[PDB]
Design an enzyme around this catalytic site. Structure first.
Site, short mmCIF file in Angstrom:
data_model
loop_
_atom_site.label_atom_id
_atom_site.label_comp_id
_atom_site.label_asym_id
_atom_site.label_seq_id
_atom_site.Cartn_x
_atom_site.Cartn_y
_atom_site.Cartn_z
N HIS A 153 11.43 -101.07 -7.70
CA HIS A 153 10.30 -101.54 -7.60
C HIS A 153 9.40 -100.99 -8.70
O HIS A 153 8.08 -101.63 -8.76
CB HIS A 153 9.41 -100.84 -6.14
CG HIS A 153 9.06 -99.41 -6.07
ND1 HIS A 153 9.81 -98.64 -5.59
CD2 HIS A 153 7.85 -98.87 -6.70
CE1 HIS A 153 8.91 -97.35 -5.84
NE2 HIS A 153 8.11 -97.74 -6.44
N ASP A 206 16.71 -99.30 -3.72
CA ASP A 206 15.58 -99.06 -4.92
C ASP A 206 16.32 -98.44 -6.11
O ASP A 206 15.83 -97.18 -6.40
CB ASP A 206 14.66 -98.43 -4.18
CG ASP A 206 13.21 -98.77 -5.10
OD1 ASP A 206 13.37 -99.14 -5.85
OD2 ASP A 206 12.29 -97.94 -4.60
N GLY A 226 2.57 -93.46 -8.74
CA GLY A 226 3.06 -93.25 -10.15
C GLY A 226 4.01 -92.07 -10.29
O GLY A 226 4.52 -91.95 -11.73
N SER A 268 7.02 -92.75 -8.82
CA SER A 268 7.93 -93.66 -8.32
C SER A 268 9.02 -93.64 -9.70
O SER A 268 8.56 -93.92 -10.80
CB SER A 268 7.29 -95.22 -8.60
OG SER A 268 6.56 -95.05 -7.11
N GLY A 269 10.32 -93.80 -9.46
CA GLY A 269 11.28 -94.16 -10.59
C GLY A 269 11.64 -92.91 -11.08
O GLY A 269 12.65 -92.76 -11.71
C1 LIG Z 1 6.82 -100.03 1.42
C2 LIG Z 1 5.64 -98.93 1.23
C3 LIG Z 1 5.81 -97.93 2.00
C4 LIG Z 1 4.60 -97.04 1.69
C5 LIG Z 1 3.51 -97.42 0.87
S1 LIG Z 1 2.40 -96.11 0.74
O1 LIG Z 1 1.02 -96.66 0.28
O2 LIG Z 1 2.13 -95.38 1.82
N1 LIG Z 1 2.93 -94.89 -0.27
C6 LIG Z 1 3.21 -95.35 -1.85
C7 LIG Z 1 2.86 -94.24 -2.66
C8 LIG Z 1 4.24 -93.54 -2.82
C9 LIG Z 1 5.12 -93.60 -3.99
C10 LIG Z 1 6.19 -92.46 -4.15
C11 LIG Z 1 6.55 -91.62 -3.40
C12 LIG Z 1 5.57 -91.42 -2.12
C13 LIG Z 1 5.58 -90.15 -1.51
N2 LIG Z 1 4.82 -90.14 -0.27
N3 LIG Z 1 6.88 -89.47 -1.51
C14 LIG Z 1 4.43 -92.15 -2.03
C15 LIG Z 1 4.63 -96.02 -1.85
O3 LIG Z 1 5.51 -95.46 -1.00
N4 LIG Z 1 5.13 -97.05 -2.83
C16 LIG Z 1 6.49 -97.36 -2.97
C17 LIG Z 1 6.53 -98.82 -2.91
C18 LIG Z 1 5.28 -99.28 -3.73
C19 LIG Z 1 4.10 -98.83 -3.61
C20 LIG Z 1 4.00 -97.45 -3.84
C21 LIG Z 1 3.47 -98.63 0.45
C22 LIG Z 1 4.40 -99.42 0.49
#
Ligand SMILES: Cc1ccc(S(=O)(=O)N[C@@H](Cc2cccc(C(=N)N)c2)C(=O)N2CCCCC2)cc1
Ligand SMILES: [Ca+2]
Length: 223
Positions: free
Chosen positions: A40, A84, A175, A177-178
């Site tokens: 992603h 992913d 942020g 992510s990855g």
């Molecule tokens: C399918 C999905 C699941 C959850 C969200 S979120 O806005 O709740 N939470 C975000 C923020 C995030 C990113 C990475 C990790 C966490 C975490 N809570 N460990 C949270 C998310 O899961 N992201 C990964 C997917 C791309 C957008 C960012 C949004 C989209």
């Protein structure tokens, strides 16, 4: 990273920033020419920034290298985030040294209870946004399968694990992510998704890298 600590400059030498005129995702250096990250995070026009601590200041030890290709797993599903994982080939090899170093791929999957280090330049706030200049770190245990599935019924595949804290307050976030989840010297996870950040009963979910070691190896050997 929410609830973490300042890592210290270059203490996580496999950590990469993916940059397109701003930091948008992390990744892990697994040899001098290849980075693993999340599918992603795919975008065109990626510069991989190695040896970073403060991402807004040139401090020394940085290497900026363009991606020559990004290989999203062919079975990545953007609705479920299953598979992913993405591989990025660097246009030229990084210089490895004390501050820019590879992380090892696992030979087996980690057990529940294993303590891991998660790092990134993502959001440090549960509610608002505050993006750090310098790299943040969080120690977190891998959770049991049954707790993970209770937290996210119907959404956890065999290629995912939970790690973090059911009480809330400590998690990865947007942020991050990855980026790496490293447990005893091996890359066991990639930061993938969660509901919010650092909420009670909603731990972070991570791509299970031990399931992908032969795909990574066969893909790198042919590219
Ligand atoms: C399918 C999905 C699941 C959850 C969200 S979120 O806005 O709740 N939470 C975000 C923020 C995030 C990113 C990475 C990790 C966490 C975490 N809570 N460990 C949270 C998310 O899961 N992201 C990964 C997917 C791309 C957008 C960012 C949004 C989209
Ligand atoms: Ca810098």
């Amino acid at each position: 990273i929410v609830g973490g600590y300042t890592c210290g400059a270059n203490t996580v030498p496999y950590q990469v920033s993916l940059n397109s005129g701003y930091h948008f995702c992390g990744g892990s250096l697994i040899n001098s020419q290849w980075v693993v990250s999340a599918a992603h995070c795919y975008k065109s026009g990626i510069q991989v920034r190695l040896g970073e601590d403060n991402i807004n200041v040139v401090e020394g030890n940085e290497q900026f290298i363009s991606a020559s290709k990004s290989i999203v797993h062919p079975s990545y599903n953007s609705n479920t985030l299953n598979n992913d994982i993405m591989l990025i080939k660097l246009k030229s090899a990084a210089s490895l040294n004390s501050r820019v170093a590879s992380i090892s791929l696992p030979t087996s999957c980690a057990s529940a209870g294993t303590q891991c280090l998660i790092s990134g330049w993502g959001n440090t706030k549960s509610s608002g946004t505050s993006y750090p200049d310098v790299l943040k770190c969080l120690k977190a245990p891998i959770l049991s399968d049954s707790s993970c599935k209770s937290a996210y019924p119907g959404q956890i595949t065999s290629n995912m694990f939970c790690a973090g804290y059911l009480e809330g307050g400590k998690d990865s976030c947007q942020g991050d992510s990855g980026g790496p989840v490293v447990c005893s010297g091996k890359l066991q996870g990639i930061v993938s998704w969660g509901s919010g950040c650092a909420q009670k009963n909603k731990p972070g979910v991570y791509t299970k890298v031990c399931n992908y070691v032969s795909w990574i190896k066969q893909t790198i050997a042919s590219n």
